[PDB]
Ligand binder design. Structure first.
Ligand SMILES: Nc1ncnc2c1ncn2[C@@H]1O[C@H](COP(=O)(O)OP(=O)(O)O)[C@@H](O)[C@H]1O
Lengths: 413, 49, 53
């Protein structure tokens, strides 16, 4: 392999002479094929560097790039590894890169798919470029390193949302492994990941899910620390826990948030969460008045996607009052119930219907301008259970109550 | 390839969509180098032959 | 073949809507079921008869 290096160095001049090469390439290509072995990967290094180098001088590459693919078609794996990684780095770029990916159809191809897809269009053409990156990541899992790997998975994300899609956003999304978030390095990245998952979920009109994400990002040490970081996320956590419909996880999430010491630092939002925790009538108007300004100021937005939240909030309010009335009142009327819920006879009947349809209360109406009835329909058996249960609880009062009486006699006299 | 690799380099086999090999049978004229192969394999590989 | 079938679909649809209009309610004055379902009473109670029966 001395002459492999020596004659290279010799031909280096010899080419560089004619490079100062199109014809001088052949006699070198042949001398590199007559070998095939150890010195053949050193011949691969030096020859594949000079061939690439010939391209750089004048470039004069329209044939080089394709010449190399033909030559590369002629092949010496690790000889080709660099030969392709060296030719990796606008119209001339298109066809050349097409030849690079064309030949590499392994960690080099992906990194030219980043460049190719995003750089080639970087605009409305996203549909055409991003076509490529809807894939290529799939089975390269173990071949890539998670930094780059996950990295352009995230690219797949944002190009897929700007594409205005959802499905592949969904599947291409869930393919992400949180376990990789033990590593602080990847932890810095995942902020992106969640941020998107928010964007998606906003599109889906989910909320509780959003709140779980904002929760998760909010768990980041990096943003735990900085007081100017965690506020605007913490807020959003509130607002969404408020918009989510009353349910299982809503409660314990809300309950947990109310406990968070940091939430004390916020003030109006504090009053909001504390306002949905407690059980009492909301009266919409006062709420809107007090909190409208402070809400709107935060970066509830326009009258489109954001404004759409305004209608939800009203719904959650209705579900709230109608949700508590079911607690206290055993029976209720109509007019007064409208008054309590502000809404007239319609806005009510509708709210109640939707709640009973989807099912969120047991209420049965008596229409003829009269009475909503919220009491469940128990049967002798149900009433008996309460009596049987009462008897049992009393026993413990009669049993527990005994030891105290004795404890005093022994401690007293 | 059938035998050794599908163990230490099968993790990517699925990336082609193909279960590791199943079995391999020598079969040849008495003295073609069969019995000497099982010895060479268990000597080099070493695992649980 | 699929057209004349709509009659079936239409029927199943009307029956449901009704069952949902009287779902949570008692003595619901029938004129209300009407205007909600957006149909003349006469054939509403014409059907509600059929359903009760
Ligand atoms: N390819 C070979 N290289 C070296 N020795 C061989 C070879 N083939 C056969 N032999 C000789 O014969 C023996 C192997 O016989 P073996 O292949 O077991 O026969 P059989 O297939 O009938 O069992 C070895 O010990 C060696 O001495």
């Amino acid at each position: 392999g001395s002459e492999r290096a020596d004659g290279r160095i010799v031909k280096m001049e010899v080419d560089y002479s004619a490079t100062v090469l199109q014809e001088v390439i052949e006699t070198l290509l042949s001398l590199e094929k007559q070998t095939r072995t150890a010195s053949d990967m050193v011949s691969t290094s030096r020859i594949l560097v000079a061939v690439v180098k010939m391209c750089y001088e004048a470039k004069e590459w329209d044939l080089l790039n394709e010449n190399i693919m033909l030559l590369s078609k002629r092949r010496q794996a690790v000889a080709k590894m660099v030969q392709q990684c060296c030719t990796y780095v606008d119209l001339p770029i298109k066809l050349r890169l097409i030849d690079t990916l064309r030949m590499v159809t392994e960690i080099e191809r992906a990194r030219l798919t980043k460049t190719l897809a995003t750089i080639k269009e970087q605009n409305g053409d996203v549909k055409e470029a991003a076509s490529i990156l809807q894939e290529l990541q799939v089975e390269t899992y173990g071949s890539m390193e998670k930094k780059e790997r996950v990295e352009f998975i995230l690219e797949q994300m944002r190009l897929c949302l700007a594409v205005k899609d959802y499905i592949r956003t969904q599947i291409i999304s869930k393919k992400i492994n949180t376990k990789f978030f033990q590593e602080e390095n990847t932890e810095k990245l995942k902020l992106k990941y969640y941020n998107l998952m928010i964007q998606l979920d906003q599109h889906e009109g989910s909320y509780l899910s959003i709140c779980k994400h904002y929760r998760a990002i909010y768990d980041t040490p990096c943003i735990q620390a900085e007081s100017e970081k965690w506020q605007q996320a913490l807020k959003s956590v509130v607002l969404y826990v408020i918009l989510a419909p009353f349910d299982n996880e809503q409660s314990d999430l809300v309950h947990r948030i109310s406990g968070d010491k940091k939430l004390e630092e916020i003030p109006k939002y504090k009053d909001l969460l504390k306002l949905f925790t407690t059980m009492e009538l909301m009266r919409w108007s006062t709420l809107v008045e007090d909190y409208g300004m402070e809400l709107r100021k935060g970066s509830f937005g326009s009258t489109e996607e954001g404004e759409k939240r305004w209608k939800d909030l009203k719904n959650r309010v209705v579900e709230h009052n109608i949700r508590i009335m079911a607690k206290y009142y055993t029976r209720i009327t109509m007019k007064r119930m409208a008054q309590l819920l502000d809404l007239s006879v319609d806005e009510s009947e509708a709210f109640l219907s939707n709640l009973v349809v989807n099912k969120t209360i047991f209420a049965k109406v008596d229409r003829l301008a009269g009475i909503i009835n919220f009491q469940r329909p128990k049967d002798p058996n149900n009433l008996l259970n309460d009596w049987s249960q009462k008897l049992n609880s009393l026993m413990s009062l009669v049993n527990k109550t005994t030891h105290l009486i004795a404890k005093e006699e022994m401690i007293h006299n | 390839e059938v035998i050794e690799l599908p163990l230490t380099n099968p993790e990517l086999f699925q990336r082609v969509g193909i279960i590791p090999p199943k079995g391999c049978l020598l079969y040849g004229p008495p003295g073609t180098g069969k019995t000497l192969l099982a010895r060479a394999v268990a000597s080099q590989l070493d695992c649980n032959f | 073949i699929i057209s004349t079938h709509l009659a079936k679909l239409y029927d199943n649809l009307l029956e449901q809507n009704l069952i949902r209009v009287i779902e949570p309610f008692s003595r619901v004055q029938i004129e209300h079921i009407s205007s909600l379902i957006k149909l003349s009473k006469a054939d509403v109670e014409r059907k509600l008869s059929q359903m009760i029966l």
